[PDB]
């Protein structure tokens, strides 16, 4: 019953007057992760007009994340250090900021924009251990996974209220509150609001089945699966909001995960331990958490 909790998802957008919008550069470099050969300055060019684009990426470059020791003072620093894919990823989250900070809710801007930017950084981390060939591309879904949380909170606050009450009084996940409250949840719109932004059905997709790997009606389904194992790995480390049934051992849980499965079935010549990357993700999540909340206030 996808399409009577789609169809729901699209009358819950349809009495908001004025929807929320991402900009042309976010749906540009959304459309190109896959073209190797793109000219770095004519992506470096974008930036030119807005100042204020241009010093939160040269800001976000010059973060021991994406720069290491070496100084990015200028967008030439930047272009020059950080390359084509760490340019377009850098620039796209400079640009979707905006998106988590124009608004308010029940839920604090902060908190969707941290538990965002986590999973968006772990699901590369995981892209990248397992040989995964666009790890932009994961990010990029990452990112935008729970961009339909946004969308009822800024857009149908005094709605998704009565979400957060339910949540915090009867400890059910957020994705449950709003299925008992709205028939929908934040999968669905967030799958209606990506689709009427006409982002790729890659990313459509991972909004979609985020929640349960185990749906992807398809065999080729690596970023849906890094970005739901990111999701629930976020949430079962305080960088998220979302909430999660009780679990008796969470390190078993991470790796037992449905998505290592359908990471290996998607990738044939991957070689991975995922015993080692949970580890490891577990060794760093400190440190993530720090740089997450301090990059932008919002
Ligand atoms: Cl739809
Ligand atoms: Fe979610
Ligand atoms: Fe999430
Ligand atoms: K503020």
């Known amino acids: 019953?996808?399409?009577?909790?789609?169809?729901?998802?699209?009358?819950?957008?349809?009495?908001?007057?004025?929807?929320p919008t991402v900009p042309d550069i976010v749906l540009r470099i959304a459309g190109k992760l896959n073209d190797p050969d793109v000219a770095?300055?004519?992506?470096?060019?974008?930036?030119?007009?807005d100042q204020?684009?241009?010093?939160?990426?040269?800001?976000?470059?010059?973060?021991?994340?994406?720069?290491?020791?070496?100084?990015?003072?200028?967008?030439?620093?930047?272009?020059?250090?950080?390359?084509?894919?760490?340019?377009?990823?850098?620039?796209?989250?400079?640009?979707?900021?905006?998106?988590?900070?124009?608004?308010?809710?029940?839920?604090?801007?902060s908190t969707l924009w941290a538990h965002s930017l986590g999973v968006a950084r772990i699901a590369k981390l995981i892209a990248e251990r397992?040989?995964?060939?666009?790890?932009?591309?994961?990010?990029?879904?990452?990112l935008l996974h729970d961009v339909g949380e946004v969308f009822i909170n800024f857009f149908r606050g005094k709605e998704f209220s009565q979400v957060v009450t339910l949540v915090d009084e009867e400890k059910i996940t957020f994705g449950q509150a709003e299925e008992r409250l709205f028939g929908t949840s934040h999968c669905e719109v967030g799958f209606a609001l990506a689709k009427r932004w006409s982002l790729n059905e890659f990313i459509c997709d991972t909004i979609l089945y985020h929640h349960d790997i185990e749906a992807v009606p398809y065999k080729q389904a690596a970023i849906?699966?890094?970005?739901?194992?990111?999701?629930?790995?976020?949430?079962?480390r305080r960088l998220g909001f979302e909430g999660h049934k009780?679990?008796?051992?969470?390190?078993?849980?991470?790796?037992?995960?449905?998505?290592?499965?359908?990471?290996?079935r998607s990738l044939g010549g991957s070689d991975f331990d995922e015993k080692l990357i949970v580890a490891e993700l577990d060794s760093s999540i400190v440190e993530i958490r720090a740089a997450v909340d301090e990059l932008f206030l919002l």
């Open 1 to 19: 019953d996808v399409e009577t909790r789609l169809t729901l998802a699209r009358e819950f957008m349809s009495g908001v007057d004025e929807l």
């Open 246 to 264: 009780p679990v008796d051992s969470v390190r078993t849980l991470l790796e037992n995960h449905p998505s290592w499965g359908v990471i290996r």
């Open 224 to 236: 849906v699966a890094m970005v739901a194992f990111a999701d629930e790995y976020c949430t079962l």
């Open 52 to 109: 204020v684009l241009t010093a939160r990426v040269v800001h976000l470059a010059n973060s021991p994340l994406y720069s290491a020791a070496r100084p990015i003072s200028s967008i030439r620093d930047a272009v020059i250090y950080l390359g084509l894919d760490l340019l377009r990823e850098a620039i796209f989250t400079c640009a979707i900021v905006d998106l988590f900070k124009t608004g308010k809710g029940p839920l604090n801007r």
């Open 40 to 49: 770095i300055d004519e992506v470096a060019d974008l930036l030119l007009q």
């Open 130 to 142: 397992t040989g995964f060939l666009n790890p932009v591309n994961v990010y990029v879904a990452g």
